[PDB]
Design a protein around this ligand. Sequence first.
Ligand SMILES: CS(=O)(=O)c1ncn2c(NCc3c(F)ccc4c3CCO4)ncc(-c3ccc(C4CC4)nc3)c12
Ligand SMILES: CS(=O)(=O)c1ncn2c(NCc3c(F)ccc4c3CCO4)ncc(-c3ccc(C4CC4)nc3)c12
Length: 359
Amino acid sequence: SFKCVNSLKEDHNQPLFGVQFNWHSKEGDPLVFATVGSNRVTLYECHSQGEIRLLQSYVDADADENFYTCAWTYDSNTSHPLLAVAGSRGIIRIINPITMQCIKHYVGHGNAINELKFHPRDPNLLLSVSKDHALRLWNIQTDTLVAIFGGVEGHRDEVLSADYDLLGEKIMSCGMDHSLKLWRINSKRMMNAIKESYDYNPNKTNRPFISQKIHFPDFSTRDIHRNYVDCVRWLGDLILSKSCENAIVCWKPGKMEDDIDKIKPSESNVTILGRFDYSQCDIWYMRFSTDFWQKMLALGNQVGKLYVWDLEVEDPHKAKCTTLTHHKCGAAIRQTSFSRDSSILIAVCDDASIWRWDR
Ligand SMILES: CS(=O)(=O)c1ncn2c(NCc3c(F)ccc4c3CCO4)ncc(-c3ccc(C4CC4)nc3)c12
Ligand SMILES: CS(=O)(=O)c1ncn2c(NCc3c(F)ccc4c3CCO4)ncc(-c3ccc(C4CC4)nc3)c12
């Protein structure tokens, strides 16, 4: 079980909106996590006796920038870790975490980015989610925009979150329009788009890289929540999503026995496999997280309380809850992150504080 071993506060005193452990850190090396808040990204190293060692920050040139999200990947030739960050400016930055240098940046239409996720099987494929109602898939090896997920049947308002399934064959996105949309990326069209993005070398051709515009999702539902869906994650062939109604719903498209890969775009049914209720987390912009093995689920609330569900149960509705409190932790917990071995849980707050819980 978890015990709070340390806490700290960042100098800017602004909320921390994101935290991510590097699950790509090498064997023997200490555990490293990134935090995002104000116009800054900061790296910390976890040590024994609850020590958190401050490393280095990337500070944006624009004092008005607000970083909302960050994601770890690695260089496809050298295996060296890389960090992607984005926020209110709508600029994706790829940072070398060693020197904290921005090595490259991407701009779509330049509208705020709410979330970044790297493909689970391809370190080069970066998904961004935006306030401009679209999702974008980038190939950071060839610096190309592979596809835009939006359009005529896409999200009708700001996209807040998205997630890849286990194999990275499909994406589930959600947002302010109350819907959850499924986008299949193993279609012939998307497989060909990805292949072509790898074959693109502008020094070797005349054609622009031709990005796909995907106007139609493979499934859509507004039957789960009755407000903004601000967080989504796959749990195998199941979905975990939350709104600001003090609940994470575990559901699936179609009827109970319907296979996710036989689901058609016209599908009108959803099946609810359970709901995890909690308290005082009815404000927008609160993220839940799972550990690497998806044995645990974590979410913080508006008043500094942490909830942890044990998912190692036969059916989702049988999950066992544990609550984590500390008399000095009273600010809203915006995001949590587990280390790869799930031995450490970091929570980040509205008052720029960082809390370390060791298993
Ligand atoms: C070899 S490559 O450079 O083309 C390549 N390098 C990486 N590729 C990825 N990565 C994402 C990925 C994945 F790694 C695992 C599961 C998954 C996807 C996306 C949909 O389902 N996807 C697709 C491809 C890919 C491969 C082969 C083909 C056939 C020859 C025409 N088409 C597409 C790919
Ligand atoms: C400026 S804004 O309100 O339009 C905004 N626009 C986008 N914002 C994001 N986006 C990331 C995001 C998300 F899309 C969904 C879930 C999620 C977060 C981060 C933690 O949990 N996060 C936070 C915020 C946010 C919230 C509260 C406040 C101050 C303390 C009162 N300021 C900003 C945000």
